[PDB]
Design a protein around this ligand. Structure first.
Ligand SMILES: NC(=O)c1ccc[n+]([C@@H]2O[C@H](COP(=O)([O-])OP(=O)(O)OC[C@H]3O[C@@H](n4cnc5c(N)ncnc54)[C@H](OP(=O)(O)O)[C@@H]3O)[C@@H](O)[C@H]2O)c1
Lengths: 175, 85, 148, 822, 98, 49, 50
């Protein structure tokens, strides 16, 4: 009986909190941080060699042609991690890339040589963030049946951020 | 707490008002030319470097530029406390 | 490839890489030509007895397709393993253009470790003349339909 | 890579025209567009565009960076530059952290470090603990970091809560966005001690203070964030923190309030501009250029990234009528279409309109077997030049078949779940078939004749497509590394592992009746400490235990290892055709070895085992396989079960062996007389078996030999692996928030032991020329195989580098290279 | 206030609201936003708006609007250590647009 | 024993509120309005005299 | 399960436990076995001697 009424006391205490705050608030303030659950992500030195390779075959399998923007995006991403071992890793691969096997190999060997020469320079230079992805704008059309579809297509006049900034310069006060 | 490395930070106003002191330190080492080459100690500190780091694998208390201030302080402290008596 | 034993333990994951690096060093791998690490134990677990069999089927399927599976739990590769240059630790399936041969090393209690090497079937077929290969191909086809 | 811009965009700003991304400057009247600061800001942005930014040694906290959100796009920017980022997720699961991992592997610039942490911004106590975890020392578990920039973006989608319906979700959102955000800064300030490293805050301001409709307390939250500017002067932390407010404009992004992606195309026609998520990321990352950084370090900086939307009167009405007209075209083009469709369906009649809808093709599964594809001969002469006539075929081992039974089913449904992470259509009906989800019913089904797949539980026909969409959730729920399900292990409940306790009675029990010889055994095994007395009416005795006897009380204790790679739950041999008798008799692991062997031979294009004897003598078909500790289910029976005198099969000990598996194989399939051997390398046992297979075959002792390994997971094995601290503790993985399917972490920086599973694995290796003479699929060529003993020690569990000796050779002087390699 | 006298209410209908109540909180700088500060923010903003959101609900006729009077302030954090007084009184201005 | 641990459950529930909100807030949100305590002041006709 | 009770001794902190009617116990017993012969290693053999 004693704990059965003291429990009623703390219940008539607790229900006040929920009555004043409501449920969703009480459910949301549940503290969830625990230092044990951290996840540090460091081993770039390995992902670099992973990505060099993944590009090396994506190129020869035609899944990434040189004209693309994403290939240049990740080549920048590669050289953002160049290590003296990365140069050797790429260099051997480009050396033994067999050209006689097809045409895409020539593309691959040549792009690889380019990237090697580049990482040889940007080596010891500070990582840089240089987005190259294609600028895109909204384009919402309704189907001839009447369905509302939202497509974020590429701009045709504004394709590089080099152009995006000039577009931002022209502003809207004189629109 | 003698650490193994110290990172100086040139933060806001007074942060810049410190790294200029480091810059102003211009020592001379007479080379084979003999000219009084008012050359810089910290070639790694300039108008761009936001923060500088010292390293001593044994411990900063062993780096000469930090140890001998500690020694002169402890010695002058003892001497002054004695003179107080 | 090198289908690692890789039992997600402290000592094994470093010792295995140490042996692979040192033995690829002593044999004179061309620098910057590391072997890839596949770690089926991430996905299947560690079949305390039969680990080698799963690893070996993995090796043969790799030899056939040319794909290289990846540790899709490769959260963050341990810092210490960067010193082993002659190895690579993928975390994403990468279909290559063809694999010559695959290593399979597996370690046991009481210091009974072992290593297998699986060369591609093709290099076998090239030891024998045309007529035999073509005649074997026909029988294989027949067996294939029958097994199907 | 380092071009050079001579014509700064600052000169391209049209006269007295306000750019789309302009910095504002405060005056006594208030905030207004300053040309000089904004020209500077744009110049830094252009440099970032053609050359880029760098955040080497920039320590940043980023909050509310969920996938598909703005904060996630600046993470790609921070990492790519070389930051040191703290991240935070309101919720933490597997798909979250792996998304972050993909990001860090695709943009993890050298030097950059990422940290994902669970953190709810709604809790005073989460914020107290988080900065501690950031500013405390590694020796105390902290991070030793010192935040250079904070990006507290986290927010709640609250909507429809008008002024009168400010509900609990609204108060919680206000807490997350303001009254807990300020606490985060008030904490980080306290954690700071040096005034040289100020933490540039970035504050996601907004240009719409209640100018939109029903969003709850979103307004008086985001607008209360502006007080900092004046407070940076009023208060004392002017040098600890520097506020750098951003006014994020129309982001056509997901979540938050993206509810409006359809009218962006519309309002952009006023000459106003929106931004993608990457564009808004760029616009903000511009607030980190080393010159803007300094600019903030002396002035609070209002940055207006709102793309000129502030020049639209009553934008609310504009957007409302835009969405209204959009819906008014959508619905009328829908309804008029419906009307003209049904009008035609009436006039033309409903008999031809079905013929206008094309008869689409349903897809089936096309499970083939597909032996490895043979290239053409002349083609193969290109992969390999003149290797011809060189090897003796009779001395080349070649794996002609293989199969498994693992937690992902057979060798195909494991290789697929491995190399593809997702089951194809065929690889899905197979996993259904071996998990007992579908059964190929044939004949009459509820009157109608039927020959096709059928559900197993309700027995109703199912097309080949609904297989995936209907079971893929369950298959992936009950297959592979998961928490151990007791019905696969005779009630072994790791939560309630049973144990018996040696206990001495203190008061004689109540006399209970028992049998004659049982009473006799009780007396003989307890001495005078018990009594027996016959019941003359029954002949069976009573027995009373007396004070001082030793009893054995049952008990249980919560065990740790709650995870193991079970065989796909529902796997049953009957599906393969093992007679129920053998099932009822032998140890479960033998079932696994048999179901593996059969389909291994199948994978070798062998239909019936006797086919071998057409080309080879009976004494030349061996079985050099063997387990690591197989039979544990029977070792339990003979050791811990009989001691309890539970009803146990009489001849269990014949299955407790390790060669007893290959015994059953030969007894049921091969009936051969080749060399049986049986290795035990418990962990590395399936590879040494292959070495045995080769030393066998090359010796001419046998021309075909099964070789593989197999083992079974059971309780007593798991408990003792635990007490050796070999397998990863499950409870400690859940305090670390590792989900079952991801605590088997090879090579991981935070690996903690292995995760044991069960099953088997078989390969039918074979002489080369015999293989190509039978015409079997040569899947491989085992070139090398060896084993080794590591080095003298005093600890069995520690491995060593003995296997290195497969590569040792001689390197004294190479002037004369060995001509034997040419 | 809005319920009937027969149910104990007042039958009134507010023509004007003057919600001035506030807490003296002081010395709670940016780093010492304490429980008194969160309570003060509640009294001054996130419960003041609820009062209006209630009075609106209690209304039924659109001829008698209730003129709110909002004790704004010209000092948005321009003074020193007052806790959440600023981003409370300044969040009251959103009503105009709302 | 049953109510003694269920009471511990609701205690480990309640202490969360105070830990996240702190004392003064909990002491201040104590609802105090009660229609019975109203005081209507009308009789001006008397105060005038 | 409920088939037993536990109660703390506040003077000791260690508990009492009473088993209730219906629980499953494990009584020891013995039975005269047949195989009383086996080729033991010479009785008294000990490795220390080696
Ligand atoms: N996008 C715009 O158009 C726009 C306009 C004006 C202002 N803003 C500002 O910019 C920011 C970007 O938001 P958005 O609209 O782009 O996307 P969003 O949908 O607002 O993003 C919400 C993110 O905040 C995190 N989060 C949610 N609840 C949380 C809680 N209780 N505790 C901690 N974190 C929580 C989530 O991360 P997890 O999923 O990891 O938990 C989620 O990814 C917002 O904070 C907003 O103030 C944006």
């Amino acid at each position: 009986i004693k704990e059965k009424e003291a429990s009623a006391v703390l219940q008539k205490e607790l229900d006040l909190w929920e009555a004043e705050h409501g449920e969703f608030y009480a459910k949301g303030i549940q503290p969830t941080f625990s230092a044990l659950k951290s996840r540090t992500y460091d081993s770039y030195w390995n992902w670099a060699r992973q990505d060099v390779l993944s590009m090396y075959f994506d190129i020869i399998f035609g899944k990434l042609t040189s004209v693309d923007r994403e290939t240049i995006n990740q080549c920048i991403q590669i050289m953002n991690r160049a290590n003296p071992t990365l140069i050797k890793f790429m260099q051997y691969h480009i050396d033994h890339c067999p050209e006689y096997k097809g045409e895409t190999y020539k593309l691959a060997k040549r792009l690889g040589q380019q990237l090697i020469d580049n990482c040889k320079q940007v080596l010891t230079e500070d990582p840089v963030y240089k987005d190259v992805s294609r600028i895109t704008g909204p384009k919402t059309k309704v189907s001839a049946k009447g369905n509302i579809e939202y497509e974020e297509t590429q701009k045709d006049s504004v394709r590089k951020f080099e152009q995006y900034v000039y577009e931002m310069a022209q502003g809207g006060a004189m629109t | 707490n003698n650490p193994n490395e110290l990172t100086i930070h040139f933060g806001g106003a007074k942060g810049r008002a410190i790294r200029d002191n480091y810059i102003g330190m211009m020592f001379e080492t007479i080379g084979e030319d003999g000219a009084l080459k008012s050359e810089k100690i910290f070639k790694d500190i300039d108008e761009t470097t936001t923060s500088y780091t010292f390293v001593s694998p044994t411990g900063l208390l062993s780096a000469t530029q930090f140890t001998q201030p500690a020694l002169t302080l402890m010695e002058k402290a003892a001497y002054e406390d004695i003179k107080s008596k | 490839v090198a289908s690692f034993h890789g039992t997600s333990t402290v000592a094994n994951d470093k010792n295995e890489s140490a042996t692979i690096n040192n033995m690829m060093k002593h044999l004179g791998r061309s620098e910057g030509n590391p072997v890839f690490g596949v770690f089926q134990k991430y996905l299947t677990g560690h079949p305390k007895g039969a680990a080698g069999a799963w690893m070996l089927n993995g090796a043969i399927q790799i030899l056939e397709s040319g794909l290289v599976p990846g540790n899709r739990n490769a959260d963050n590769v341990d810092k210490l393993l960067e010193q082993y240059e002659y190895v690579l630790y993928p975390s994403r399936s990468i279909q290559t253009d063809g694999i010559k041969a695959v290593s399979v090393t597996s370690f046991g209690f009481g210091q009974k470790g072992a290593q297998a090497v699986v060369v591609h079937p093709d290099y076998l077929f090239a030891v024998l003349d045309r007529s035999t290969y073509e005649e074997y191909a026909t029988k294989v086809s027949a067996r294939n339909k029958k097994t199907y | 890579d380092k071009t050079s811009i001579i014509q700064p965009v600052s000169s391209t700003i049209p006269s007295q025209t306000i750019p789309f991304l302009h910095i504002q400057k405060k005056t006594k009247d208030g905030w207004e567009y300053n040309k000089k600061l904004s020209s500077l800001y744009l110049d830094g942005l252009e440099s970032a565009a053609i050359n880029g930014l760098t955040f080497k040694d920039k320590y940043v906290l980023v909050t509310g960076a969920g996938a598909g959100s703005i904060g996630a796009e600046i993470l790609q920017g921070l990492i790519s530059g070389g930051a040191k980022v703290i991240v935070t997720t309101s919720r933490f699961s597997k798909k979250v952290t792996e998304y972050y991992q993909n990001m860090y592997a695709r943009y993890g610039a050298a030097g950059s470090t990422l940290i994902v942490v669970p953190f709810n911004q709604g809790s005073k106590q989460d914020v107290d603990a988080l900065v501690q975890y950031i500013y405390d020392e590694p020796k105390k578990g902290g991070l030793g970091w010192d935040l250079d920039a904070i990006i507290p973006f986290a927010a709640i989608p609250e909507n429809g809560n008008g002024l009168d319906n400010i509900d609990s979700k609204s108060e919680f959102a206000h807490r997350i966005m303001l009254t807990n955000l300020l606490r985060l800064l008030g904490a980080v300030k306290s954690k700071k001690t040096t005034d040289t490293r100020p933490a540039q805050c970035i504050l996601p301001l907004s240009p719409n203070h209640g100018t939109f409709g029903f969003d709850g307390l979103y307004s008086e939250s985001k607008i209360s964030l502006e007080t900092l500017f004046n407070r940076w002067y009023s208060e004392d932390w002017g040098s600890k923190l520097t506020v750098c407010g951003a006014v994020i404009g129309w982001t056509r992004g997901t979540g938050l309030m993206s509810a409006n992606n359809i009218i962006a195309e519309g309002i952009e026609k006023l000459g106003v501009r929106t931004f993608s998520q990457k564009e808004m990321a760029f616009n903000i990352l511009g607030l980190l250029t080393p010159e803007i950084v300094q600019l903030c370090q002396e002035e609070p900086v209002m940055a207006d990234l709102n793309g000129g939307l502030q020049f639209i009167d009553n934008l609310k009405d504009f957007t409302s009528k835009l969405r209204t007209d959009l819906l008014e075209t959508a619905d009328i083009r829908r309804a008029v279409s419906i009307e003209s469709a049904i009008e035609q369906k009436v006039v033309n009649g409903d008999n031809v309109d079905a013929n206008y809808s094309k008869v689409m093709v349903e897809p089936r599964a096309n499970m083939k077997f597909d032996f490895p594809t043979l290239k053409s001969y002349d083609e193969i002469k290109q992969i390999a030049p003149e290797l011809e006539g060189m090897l003796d075929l009779e001395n080349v081992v070649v794996v002609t078949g293989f199969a498994e039974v693992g937690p992902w089913g057979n060798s195909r449904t494991r290789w697929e779940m491995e190399a593809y992470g997702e089951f194809s259509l065929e690889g899905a009906i197979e996993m259904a078939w071996i998990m007992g989800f579908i059964k190929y019913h044939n004949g009459n089904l509820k009157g109608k004749p039927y020959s096709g797949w059928v559900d197993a539980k309700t027995q109703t026909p199912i097309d080949e497509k609904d297989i995936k969409s209907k079971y893929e959730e369950e298959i992936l729920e009950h297959s592979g590394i998961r928490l151990i399900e007791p019905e696969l292990f005779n009630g072994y409940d790791p939560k309630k592992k049973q144990m018996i306790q040696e206990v001495v009675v203190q008061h004689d029990l109540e006399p209970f009746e028992c049998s004659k010889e049982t009473a006799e055994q009780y007396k003989h095994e307890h001495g005078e400490k018990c009594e027996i007395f016959e019941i003359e009416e029954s002949g069976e005795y009573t027995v009373r235990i007396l004070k001082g006897a030793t009893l054995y009380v049952p008990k249980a204790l919560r065990f740790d290892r709650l995870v193991a790679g079970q065989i796909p739950t529902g796997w049953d041999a009957r599906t393969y055709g093992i007679p129920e008798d053998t099932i009822s008799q032998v140890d479960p692991i033998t079932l696994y070895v048999l179901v593996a062997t059969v389909e291994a031979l199948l994978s070798a294009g062998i239909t019936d085992p006797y086919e071998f004897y057409k080309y080879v003598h009976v004494s030349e078909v061996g079985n050099c396989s063997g387990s690591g500790m197989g039979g544990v289910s029977a070792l339990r029976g003979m050791f811990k079960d009989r001691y309890a005198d539970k009803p146990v099969q009489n001849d269990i000990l014949q299955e407790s062996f390790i060669n007893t598996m290959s015994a059953w194989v030969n007894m049921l399939l091969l009936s051969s007389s080749g060399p049986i051997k049986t290795p035990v390398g418990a962990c590395a046992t399936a590879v040494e078996s292959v070495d045995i297979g080769i030393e066998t075959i090359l010796s001419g002792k046998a021309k075909v030999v099964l070789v593989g390994g197999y083992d079974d997971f059971q309780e007593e094995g798991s408990y003792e692996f635990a007490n050796m601290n070999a397998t990863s503790n499950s409870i400690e993985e859940f305090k670390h928030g590792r989900t079952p399917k991801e605590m088997s972490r090879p090579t991981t920086t935070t690996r903690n032991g292995f995760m044991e599973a069960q099953g088997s694995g078989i390969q039918v290796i074979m002489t080369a020329d015999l293989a190509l003479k039978m015409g079997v699929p040569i899947h491989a060529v085992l070139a090398m195989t060896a084993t080794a003993t590591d080095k003298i020690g005093r600890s069995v569990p520690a491995p060593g580098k003995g296997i290195l000796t497969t590569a040792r050779e001689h390197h004294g002087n190479l002037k004369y290279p060995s001509p034997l390699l040419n």
